[PDB]
RNA sequence: GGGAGACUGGAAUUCCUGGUGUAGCGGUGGAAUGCGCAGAUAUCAGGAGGAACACCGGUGGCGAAGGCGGGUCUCUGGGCAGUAACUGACGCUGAGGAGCGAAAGCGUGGGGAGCGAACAGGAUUAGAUACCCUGGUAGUCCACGCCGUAAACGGUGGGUACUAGGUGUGGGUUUCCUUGGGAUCCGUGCCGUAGCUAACGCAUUAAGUACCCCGCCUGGGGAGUACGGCCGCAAGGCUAAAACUCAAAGGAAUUGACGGGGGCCCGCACAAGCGGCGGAGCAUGUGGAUUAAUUCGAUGCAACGCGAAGAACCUUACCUGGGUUUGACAUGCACAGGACGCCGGCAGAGAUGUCGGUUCCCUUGUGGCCUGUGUGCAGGUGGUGCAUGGCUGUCGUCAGCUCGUGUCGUGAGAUGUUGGGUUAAGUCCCGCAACGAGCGCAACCCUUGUCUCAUGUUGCCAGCACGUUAUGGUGGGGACUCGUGAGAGACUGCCGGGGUCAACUCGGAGGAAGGUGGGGAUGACGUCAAGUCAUCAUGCCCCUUAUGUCCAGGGCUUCACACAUGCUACAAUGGCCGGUACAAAGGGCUGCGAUGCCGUGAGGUGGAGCGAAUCCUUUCAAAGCCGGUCUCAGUUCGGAUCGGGGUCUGCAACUCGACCCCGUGAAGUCGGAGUCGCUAGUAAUCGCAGAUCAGCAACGCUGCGGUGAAUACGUUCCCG
RNA sequence: CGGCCAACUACGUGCCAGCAGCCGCGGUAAUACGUAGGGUCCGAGCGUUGUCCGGAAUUACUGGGCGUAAAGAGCUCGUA
């Protein structure tokens, strides 16, 4: 319908930075499987405890796992006992030795996948959905510096039978524009009626910054 | 490149062995696909037969038959309420070379001869003399030309 | 109109001064067909008013019904119309005519209460009036009835306008018994406003 | 051109007699019935007879309304102005009532040229009882009467008084310039305030403000119909219900869509070409029929070499059979444990069972490990894309889609975004109750085209040296490439003309390139309940002794058919044999595999050398060029099919693999209606590599390069 | 105990059985059908049916209309 290009899958070769890096021949196929159960791994607790991005910058077999988040307090908890239990568990599944470092976003409302975190986490807690975004808004129009931002929701919305899609912005969030350094997050609500998937488009600014 | 007016249309280069633009033109247009050397082949040799049987320029016995088999007016089939209309119409003259040689080609084509080089041989001779059927295809197109004149006044 | 109850650690709501009186009267979805299906926008017709009997008339649109009812509520406050009284009543029987609301606002003796159509009776609610008397004639809408009913205080006017057009000096105006209903009204002005200043 | 009566005028059509004169005339989108060749149509002269009145003549005159236009005469009706002489409220309206009242129709008697219902033939069409054509009776005309109906409409009853104006034109009086202007009374139009209206509109000729009298309306059908009466020669008119039934039927305006509406534009949309498909054989996919099973999905464009970038077993979802229960896989409980699990032997289609060797690592309480027995439970390629998310197609890479604030409108809404020009483009200028913004378009990015600087191995080799056999092969060298980094360069920037001195367009120069240089990546708001619960995730419903799961065999490859995309062809621009020249990109670890040797050939034996600008895929090609032969034929074309004989991959080529050798040698002679692709390195043709993959159904898909055309007059027509 | 119109959730049937004053609810997730909880309104009563007035300015004296929505006799003359 909308046939929209991943945004983050369309500036990776200009702007946004890859999330896994390393080099890898005919080692490229273990090294891909491991990524994926990490990043298994690292969906539950930390889709609790507020997690954002996850890199992986593999040296010589070691690893190190990284993850961007918005609460440095829940995913370190008791020092070594909330770190140590998945950084450990992390180094049972995979067969190597993990370097965990964990580090905080200096705004929350201004990364697209924890504006969707935080809009679908409230839209499963039977809020009012246009109250929601609308308030997903305001805040991060803001607050840093952030030049556009645009939510869509689709799926049963206030557990209606019809699949009507919203769309509310504010600014300028231009797509086909490859200077734009533009943040996307889709994260999916989980109501009992269903799954309401929202779709957070963040345009920072015009910057290259090459 | 209809619709927004002329479009313009690559120069063309005349032959080594004759130095003609016709030769070539007629080159370009004997290429069954792929092969224009071989096209050059067939055409050199059709007009050095043509060499043999006249004993003069080739050049001249083509442009002759192309002069013999070149027509003046076509027919078109433009359709004014229920009724379709053969309309004759001016005949430029790139469009007059274009179909003079591609009728010669054509109907070299059709002609009996073993190879290439004696049917293309044999209908520029028979077209210099004006005893091909691709002269009677001239002659067929001013028919339907002069049979259908009244219909020529739209001035379209 | 939904999820209004909450608490917000933000930085204001932004309450503030004129706790004006406000009613919204109607809302309907106004659709408009365009390529490929129905836009579909709202529409609320805003009353709001103090109760000396300042009236405001606001309609918005907005494809949000709290956006809609906002966009009401600024323009009414663009837009507010002075409504003369006695006491608490209206001051004589008028007819109102918005072309095709006819409103019949008749006065009545005190106690009585407004009866009026919901239309009616909002834009009298939010107004000055405890105790009138008025019908809707015709139209039987909710902006003809309001816009009449405003019409219809627009051809309100004064004792003392009255005379003043005729160059009459007062008692020489009005009939007794709504002298003495204005020598009641200022009474009790006289006596809550110097209640008010202690 | 108010009416009636009477007399008369010419042009034109038709017929008639007579000339002149020949084979067509008539008619149509195109034709045919038709009139002709016995003298038509054509033209000239004369005659008859009827009807209608060109020009003046129109937004104009008159009439109460119908209505009224050749002329003249006779009889007669109304209107307007001027003076104010007379009468002195005699005014207004008007239920019933009488009269007038287009056209069609009716009666009796005339008249009958043209036109012409009905009525024929012709044509069109599936079919025309229709339009179109040829003929044609009542009628149309007059005299005398009937009838009484119309969108008889200004859709506006008659009278009266008042309420800003502006400009036409018709009739008449007067003051001034001296026909011009003014003022006035009566008429008829166009625009316009206030006011009015639901809105459109009306607006001194009211639908405004008020008074007087009349008509008439009370939801839509039923129905202006029945019954009854009245009028009528009749057709019919007038007056006028109910049962029953519906939840509406309506008015104006708004946004869209739509039109066999208008205008302006574009696209391989048509035209101009070139090559195809549809006929033949096969390869793939689908329908249908089969079947134990032919797993499941995808059916206009946008399903059908599509999910499949690889069906012998596996895959696998299906079938017959054999097994199985905490299950093939988790994890939480209880409960016993001490090894779990392994490597075998045997019986078995195999799953599996039964025998043989190994028996735990911490600790003292258990944990690492499983089996049991249960318990929650796992598991479902079971159902619902009409409950969804995600991903995707499509309209279309089309130029559009909106919003904020202001104004306009009772409101839906409008405006902006329309107008003038311009553009690949809502691109951009100039205007305009709008002023701005946003998502698109463009630009940013990759690749291709030129040069500069950097640049030297595995890459190049000019100038040097050494090779002799084989070549950059080797010492060497930065000169040329080339490889990959940085940078310059195309901006209407420079000159000429049109432009409103604006945008932009036509030519020229420089330049590798000229005007978005070429191609990509890039899909706006939304559409289609489009696709997918079989990638995944998932709400709800269903199975839980099976709809789970394990294995062998079979099927997904069946075949009287029909479609769809491809490939090889039907030959001489060709086939076959010999000699010879030029690519680009790629691929490679239990992989790519050379020289050599054995084969006819798939290949076998062997391992040089390479995780690769090095080694291998041979130094890479094929079409090309030179030469020989074949002589137009069912052939030295064509390779399907079938028989024998092999090789390789794999536990295994029967159902079902590819390749090679020998033989065999079918259809097929350029393909009906129809239809498809393509505008320059394109079409056409020629090989090469890759992914998936042990092998391959690869003629597929994705890419790479080689050789390389024709045509575009132009928007009438088809399509969007 | 959809809306008007004070008062909502689950289970059971999934165009059936039924509901309803009008608008309209039932096509395996009904706050509209049936049963349950719970709520609301009344209370020795509470619902239904019928008949009348009201709302109905919907026969308009008070208090309506007739360009296009229903509605100006085809047009005049004239008796009461």
């Given at each position: 319908?909308?046939?929209?290009?991943?945004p983050?899958?369309?500036?990776?070769?200009?702007?946004?930075?890859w999330?896994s890096?390393?080099?890898?021949?005919?080692?490229?196929?273990?090294?891909?499987?491991?990524?994926?159960?990490?990043?298994?791994?690292?969906?539950?607790?930390l889709?609790?405890?507020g997690?954002?991005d996850?890199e992986?910058?593999?040296?010589?077999?070691?690893?190190?796992?990284?993850?961007?988040?918005?609460?440095?307090?829940?995913?370190?908890?008791?020092?070594?006992?909330?770190?140590?239990?998945?950084?450990?568990?992390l180094?049972?599944?995979?067969?190597?030795?993990?370097?965990?470092?964990?580090?905080?976003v200096?705004?929350?409302?201004?990364?697209?996948?924890?504006?969707?975190?935080?809009?679908?986490?409230?839209?499963?807690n039977?809020?009012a959905?246009?109250?929601?975004?609308?308030?997903?808004?305001?805040?991060?129009?803001?607050?840093?510096?952030?030049?556009?931002?645009?939510?869509?929701?689709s799926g049963r919305?206030?557990?209606?039978?019809?699949?009507?899609?919203?769309?509310?912005?504010?600014?300028?969030?231009?797509?086909?524009?490859?200077?734009?350094?533009?943040?996307?997050?889709?994260?999916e609500?989980?109501?009992?009626?269903?799954?309401?998937?929202?779709?957070?488009?963040?345009?920072?600014?015009?910057?290259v910054?090459? | 490149m209809?619709?927004?007016?002329?479009?313009?249309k690559?120069?063309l280069?005349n032959?080594?062995?004759?130095?003609?633009?016709?030769?070539?033109?007629?080159?370009?247009?004997?290429?069954?696909?792929?092969?224009?050397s071989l096209?050059?082949?067939?055409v050199?040799?059709?007009?050095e037969?043509?060499r043999?049987?006249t004993?003069?320029?080739?050049?001249?016995?083509?442009?002759?038959?192309?002069?013999?088999?070149?027509?003046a007016?076509?027919?078109?089939?433009?359709?004014?309420?229920?009724?379709?209309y053969?309309?004759?119409?001016?005949?430029?003259?790139?469009?007059?070379?274009?179909?003079?040689?591609?009728?010669?080609?054509?109907?070299?084509?059709?002609?009996?001869?073993?190879?290439?080089?004696?049917?293309?041989?044999?209908?520029?001779?028979?077209?210099?003399?004006?005893?091909?059927?691709?002269?009677?295809?001239?002659?067929?197109?001013?028919?339907?030309?002069?049979?259908?004149?009244?219909?020529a006044?739209?001035?379209? | 109109?939904?999820?209004?109850?909450?608490?917000?650690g933000?930085?204001?709501?932004?309450?503030?001064?004129?706790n004006?009186?406000?009613?919204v009267?109607?809302?309907?979805?106004?659709?408009?067909?365009?390529?490929?299906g129905?836009?579909?926008?709202?529409?609320?017709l805003?009353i709001?008013?103090?109760?000396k009997?300042?009236?405001?008339?606001?309609?918005?649109?907005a494809?949000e019904?709290?956006?809609?009812?906002?966009?009401?509520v600024?323009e009414?406050?663009?837009?507010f119309?002075?409504?003369?009284?006695?006491?608490?009543?209206?001051?004589?029987?008028?007819?109102g005519?918005?072309?095709?609301?006819?409103?019949?606002?008749?006065?009545?003796?005190?106690?009585?209460?407004?009866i009026?159509?919901?239309?009616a009776?909002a834009?009298?609610?939010?107004?000055?009036?405890?105790?009138?008397?008025?019908?809707?004639?015709?139209?039987?809408?909710?902006?003809?009835?309001?816009?009449?009913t405003?019409?219809?205080?627009?051809?309100?006017?004064?004792?003392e306008?009255?005379?003043?057009?005729?160059?009459?000096?007062?008692?020489?105006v009005?009939?007794?018994?709504?002298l003495?209903?204005?020598?009641?009204?200022?009474?009790?002005?006289?006596a809550?406003?110097?209640?008010?200043?202690?």
């Amino acid at each position: 319908m909308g046939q929209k290009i991943n945004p983050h899958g369309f500036r990776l070769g200009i702007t946004t930075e890859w999330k896994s890096r390393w080099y890898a021949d005919k080692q490229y196929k273990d090294y891909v499987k491991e990524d994926v159960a990490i990043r298994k791994l690292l969906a539950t607790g930390l889709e609790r405890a507020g997690i954002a991005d996850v890199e992986i910058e593999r040296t010589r077999d070691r690893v190190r796992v990284d993850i961007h988040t918005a609460r440095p307090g829940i995913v370190i908890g008791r020092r070594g006992t909330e770190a140590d239990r998945i950084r450990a568990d992390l180094e049972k599944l995979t067969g190597k030795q993990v370097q965990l470092n964990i580090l905080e976003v200096k705004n929350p409302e201004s990364q697209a996948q924890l504006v969707a975190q935080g809009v679908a986490e409230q839209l499963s807690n039977r809020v009012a959905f246009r109250r929601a975004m609308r308030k997903a808004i305001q805040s991060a129009m803001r607050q840093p510096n952030v030049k556009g931002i645009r939510v869509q929701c689709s799926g049963r919305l206030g557990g209606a039978e019809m699949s009507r899609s919203e769309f509310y912005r504010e600014g300028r969030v231009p797509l086909h524009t490859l200077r734009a350094d533009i943040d996307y997050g889709l994260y999916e609500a989980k109501t009992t009626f269903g799954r309401i998937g929202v779709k957070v488009w963040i345009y920072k600014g015009d910057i290259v910054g090459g | 490149m209809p619709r927004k007016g002329p479009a313009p249309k690559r120069p063309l280069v005349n032959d080594p062995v004759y130095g003609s633009q016709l030769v070539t033109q007629l080159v370009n247009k004997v290429l069954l696909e792929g092969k224009k050397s071989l096209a050059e082949r067939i055409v050199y040799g059709a007009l050095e037969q043509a060499r043999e049987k006249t004993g003069t320029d080739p050049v001249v016995t083509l442009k002759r038959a192309l002069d013999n088999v070149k027509p003046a007016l076509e027919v078109r089939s433009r359709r004014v309420g229920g009724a379709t209309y053969q309309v004759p119409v001016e005949v430029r003259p790139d469009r007059s070379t274009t179909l003079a040689l591609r009728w010669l080609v054509n109907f070299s084509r059709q002609r009996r001869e073993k190879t290439m080089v004696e049917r293309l041989a044999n209908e520029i001779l028979d077209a210099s003399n004006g005893l091909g059927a691709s002269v009677k295809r001239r002659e067929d197109t001013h028919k339907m030309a002069e049979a259908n004149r009244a219909f020529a006044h739209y001035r379209w | 109109r939904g999820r209004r109850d909450d608490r917000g650690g933000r930085g204001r709501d932004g309450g503030d001064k004129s706790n004006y009186i406000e009613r919204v009267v109607s809302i309907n979805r106004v659709s408009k067909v365009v390529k490929g299906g129905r836009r579909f926008s709202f529409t609320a017709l805003v009353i709001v008013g103090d109760g000396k009997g300042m009236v405001g008339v606001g309609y918005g649109k907005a494809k949000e019904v709290p956006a809609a009812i906002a966009k009401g509520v600024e323009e009414a406050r663009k837009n507010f119309f002075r409504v003369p009284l006695i006491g608490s009543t209206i001051t004589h029987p008028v007819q109102g005519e918005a072309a095709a609301g006819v409103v019949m606002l008749r006065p009545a003796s005190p106690g009585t209460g407004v009866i009026a159509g919901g239309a009616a009776r909002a834009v009298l609610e939010c107004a000055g009036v405890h105790d009138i008397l008025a019908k809707s004639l015709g139209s039987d809408n909710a902006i003809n009835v309001v816009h009449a009913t405003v019409a219809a205080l627009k051809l309100l006017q004064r004792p003392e306008e009255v005379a003043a057009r005729r160059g009459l000096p007062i008692e020489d105006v009005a009939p007794a018994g709504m002298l003495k209903a204005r020598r009641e009204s200022e009474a009790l002005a006289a006596a809550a406003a110097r209640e008010g200043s202690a």
